[PDB]
């Protein structure tokens, strides 16, 4: 395919986020590379406005599912690459149990040879001493299954999953993700049969990075269709 072909090798990534959580404003820039052959994403982010006012792990899902590895028998179900290079809009609402919610709108598209994820994020109704604004999340991440169905209406897909954030007191805080992706271009896209992405992530720190930052590794593989 055409969209497929843009991802046969390593692709550089840029990420830019403008955020407002409970009126608390911030900006993040990140960069790295994706290799959809392995399903691998590696990214580093800094908060360019000072200290991030929310925990880094709450922004992992917001910070490029076109880098998922789709097995060959599933390649006709890969909406994300099929919209490329024109790209897609990715919108979410993320509900933090008994706390506030994020609403995000991103454009994911090629700018030159670089895959760019440009995000606007608005967060409201957070408890000022909740787990999020109180910074009670552990700096880590777990594995999740990302459920994808076509939304033929909108020529795109609808996606839902629940993230498990570990809290420092031993408990777990769920973030209910509702997501829609719609193509930016006018070319045809692949509308998939129901399937899911198996995602796994690991967060770390660059011991030499003086700014508030996050290093993210994601591994993502599609599954749920047989043969």
């Amino acid at each position: 395919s055409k969209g497929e072909e843009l991802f046969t090798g390593v692709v550089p990534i840029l990420v830019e986020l403008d955020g407002d959580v409970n009126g608390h404003k911030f900006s993040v820039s990140g960069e790295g590379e994706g290799d959809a052959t392995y399903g691998k994403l590696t990214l580093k982010f800094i908060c360019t406005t000072g200290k991030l006012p929310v925990p880094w792990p709450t922004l992992v899902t917001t910070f490029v599912q076109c880098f998922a590895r789709y097995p060959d028998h599933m390649k006709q179900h890969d909406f994300f690459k099929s919209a490329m290079p024109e790209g897609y809009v990715q919108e979410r609402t993320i509900f933090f149990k008994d706390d506030g919610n994020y609403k995000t709108r991103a454009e994911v598209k090629f700018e030159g040879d670089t895959l760019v994820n440009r995000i606007e994020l608005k967060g409201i109704d957070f408890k000022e001493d909740g787990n999020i604004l109180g910074h009670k999340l552990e700096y880590n991440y777990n594995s999740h299954n990302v459920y994808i169905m076509a939304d033929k209406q909108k020529n795109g897909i609808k996606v839902n999953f629940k993230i498990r954030h570990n809290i420092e007191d031993g408990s777990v805080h769920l973030a209910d993700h509702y997501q829609q992706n719609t193509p930016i271009g006018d070319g045809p896209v692949l509308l998939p049969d129901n399937h899911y992405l198996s995602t796994q992530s690991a967060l770390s720190k660059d011991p030499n990075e003086k700014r508030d930052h996050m290093v993210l590794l994601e591994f993502v593989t599609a599954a749920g269709i047989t043969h």
């Epitope: 840029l14 820039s29 990140g30 960069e31 360019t48 030499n208 990075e209 003086k210 700014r211």
Partner: nanobody, 124 residues
Amino acid sequence: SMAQVQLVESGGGLVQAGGSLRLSCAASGPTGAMAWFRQAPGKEREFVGGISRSGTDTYYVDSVKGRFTIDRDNAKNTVYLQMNSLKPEDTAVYYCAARRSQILFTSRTDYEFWGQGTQVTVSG
């Protein structure tokens, strides 16, 4: 899109504690974030301050905040470091550094291009 460049440092020199010195650096072509590192004798190269491609993001380590200033000229492909109220502990070999990406990361490992190092000596 950004390419291989060479960095040519000028300025610096010898000064008495409390004085001022200016460093400058000229890239052979356009580049992204630019920064200054320093290596004091028998210590590791360390980040001093830097500036994003656009100039709207700068960052300084705490020990120089308020005394050092950086700015850049994307028309001339240069950057400078104006160092005021210098202290003997500011003595070091200073390196200009750059990267293709616009983003002002601060780890040595994030920088692809390097000047050869310019001596700054502050006499107590």
